[PDB]
């Protein structure tokens, strides 16, 4: 009888650690996707100086969820409007909304797609 | 130094960076001389063992 410890330190024995196999579920029904596409992008912005960005910079301008992000915004734009996207800049306007400058790739003309959506 | 080629941060000798040529020259010698004198330090006390 004995056993050899070559360390004078006793450690907490590594032990099972099961897995939660509940019995009754947390929620009843998993929340639907908060922040989907119609929610990411809320509105075009159509002040005259944004309009110039459409006419001259291949840029679509949107008020966009405060909760969005350059990924989430690009995706929604890419799908609601069937267009490809070069980069998104964003800022938080001083009235507390987020505006997104979305430049389209050169395969697209924002002005075209601007007045497809139906503003000018 | 993480954006640089290895040749930039070594030389070709025992102890590339680390130490400084005259310090490895001293270093080898000190090694050899002592390891020699060991053998002796050793053999010499084995002689005066028999002498007893």
């Amino acid at each position: 009888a004995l056993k050899v410890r070559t360390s004078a330190t006793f450690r907490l024995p590594k032990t099972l650690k099961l897995a939660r196999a509940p019995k009754y579920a947390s929620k009843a029904v998993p929340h639907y996707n908060r922040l989907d596409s119609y929610k990411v992008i809320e509105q075009p912005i159509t002040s005259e100086t944004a309009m110039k960005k459409v006419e001259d910079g291949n840029i679509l301008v949107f008020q966009v969820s405060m909760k969005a992000n350059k990924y989430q915004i690009k995706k929604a734009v890419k799908e609601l409007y069937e267009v490809d996207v070069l980069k998104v800049n964003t800022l938080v306007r001083p009235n507390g909304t987020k505006k997104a400058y979305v430049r389209l790739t050169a395969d697209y003309d924002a002005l075209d797609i601007a007045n497809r959506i139906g503003y000018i | 130094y993480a954006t640089v080629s290895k040749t930039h941060k070594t030389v070709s000798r025992a102890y590339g960076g680390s130490r400084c040529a005259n310090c490895v020259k001293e270093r080898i010698i000190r090694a050899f001389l002592i390891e020699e004198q060991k053998i002796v330090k050793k053999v010499v006390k084995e002689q005066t063992e028999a002498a007893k």
């Binding site: 050899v4 410890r5 070559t6 004078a8 006793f10 | -």
Partner: protein, 231 residues
């Protein structure tokens, strides 16, 4: 061979990192490990008084093996058993004769402190096994003394766990038979003879001595050496 080499290593003070060795002697064990170890020890140093010292007198491997082999013949009813009887017993008797004496008189081990104390009080016990390791000890310290007054043969036996297995439980504290089949008064008395001598006649002497003292290695040695070299 002439290619391999014998390079011994020096392991003295001053060289060669000391090799892995066995330090079980020196581990900083978890606090519950120490406490149960020092408790045992604290209880060893310090005069233990006669009535607690009665225990530690176990019962030899062979007389115990004998006494369990007999005790093992008197298992109480198992679950399945009593179910089966309770249907046989009740379904018939409660619509037939003998006041549930539609089953033979049983012979079982008798267990449980309260129960077994009263058996002893009532001079109904034929032989009684008290465990050596009841904690709190007070549950069981009066027993040998009680048995002494009442005539009841008794052995302090080893294993509270073992008297457990003897009544289909985790632990059992006491266990003592009273009845017994006639094909068996023989063995019984042969046990009681050897037991009673060991554990019962000796009562009045045992009850006069204390335990404890004991120094633990080191101290025992330096009083060994103190008195040995200097005499």
């Amino acid at each position: 061979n002439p290619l391999t080499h014998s390079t011994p290593k020096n392991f003295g003070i001053g060289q060669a990192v000391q090799p892995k060795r066995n330090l079980s002697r020196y581990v900083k064990w978890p606090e519950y490990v120490r406490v149960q170890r020092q408790k045992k020890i604290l209880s060893i140093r310090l005069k233990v008084p006669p009535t607690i010292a009665q225990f530690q007198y176990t019962l030899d491997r062979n007389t115990a093996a004998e006494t369990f082999k007999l005790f093992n013949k008197y298992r109480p009813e198992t679950a399945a058993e009593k179910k089966e009887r309770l249907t046989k017993e009740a379904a018939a008797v409660a619509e037939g004769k003998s006041k549930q004496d539609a089953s033979p008189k049983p012979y079982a081990v008798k267990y449980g402190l309260n129960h077994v104390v009263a058996l002893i009080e009532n001079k109904k016990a034929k032989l009684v096994l008290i465990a050596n390791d009841v904690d709190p000890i007070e549950l069981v310290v009066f027993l040998p003394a009680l048995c002494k007054k009442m005539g009841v043969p008794y052995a302090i036996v080893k294993g509270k766990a073992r008297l457990g297995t003897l009544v289909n439980q985790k632990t059992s504290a006491v266990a003592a038979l009273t009845e017994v089949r006639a094909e068996d008064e023989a063995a019984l008395a042969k046990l009681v003879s050897t037991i009673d001598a060991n554990f019962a006649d000796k009562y009045d002497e045992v009850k006069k001595h204390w335990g404890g003292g004991i120094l633990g290695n080191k101290a025992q040695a330096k009083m060994d050496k103190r008195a040995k070299n200097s005499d």
